[PDB]
Design a protein. Structure first.
Lengths: 152, 151
């Protein structure tokens, strides 16, 4: 079976890479995960699809983005935003986000990797992630321990 | 159409590992790499289960087959590619392939309307809801199972 040559996921709050499909997983595959809001009364979510192995999305590659708006006001972390990453038998990626309370959804289709990147480009991205593995492992260990800024 | 119940394999320790989740649209093809539990394990037992519960003993066995001839290797090294394919008629084909040799085996399982009534499906769903809290414990500690001494 074919494999995903690079990990695929979303940006979560604070610039964090949250992979839903890992590099070298076989495709086709459909992965679903419930996400939520970061702030009280948050009226929408921004869905930013990133590809790569690094811990922070600034070091990965943005493949597409869309908004799911119209989230009813609610305390942070209460809305259920179901996100699906579906890679079909042709390698095409469909990313859907659905507000479970209303059913309202949005989605984007992203071309399969062989239509976007050469094998040598992929190999270079992997080599760079290997170079920065120690740094990225520290970042992953600190995601649960981020402190807010001073108020002045 | 949708899969009315989740479909997957038994993994080490009696665990339900779903590849197609309940209410997934069909037709669909889902793939997942599995591996061996023991050093030099020469074959894998592929046990296809249907249902929502955390442990396969509480789900229903739909079929099983073996993939033998796995070359000796340390535990977890063989790449056993598993495919669950549901076609436009709802027929389920489950294949397991040893990536290094190409050797595969497969079983075909009747589409759900040829096996189960709507009432049977609803009863399985209702029973799983009753035991969701109990099953949530098993899911939370599956990564934290300890061995015992041998003698």
């Amino acid at each position: 079976s074919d494999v995903a040559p690079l990990s695929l996921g979303l940006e979560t709050a604070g610039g964090v890479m949250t992979a839903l499909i890992k590099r070298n997983s076989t495709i086709p595959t459909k992965q679903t995960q419930i996400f939520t809001t970061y702030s009280d009364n948050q009226p929408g979510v921004l869905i930013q699809v990133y590809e790569g192995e690094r811990a922070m999305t600034k070091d990965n590659n943005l493949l597409g983005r869309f908004e799911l708006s119209g989230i009813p006001p609610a305390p942070r972390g209460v809305p259920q935003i179901e996100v699906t990453f579906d890679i079909d038998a042709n390698g095409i990626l469909n990313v859907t986000a659905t507000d479970k309370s209303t059913g309202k959804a949005n989605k984007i289709t992203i071309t399969n990797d062989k239509g976007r990147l050469s094998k040598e480009e992929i190999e270079r991205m992997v080599q760079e992630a290997e170079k920065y593995k120690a740094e990225d492992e520290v970042q992953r260990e600190r995601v649960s321990y981020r402190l807010p800024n001073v108020h002045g």
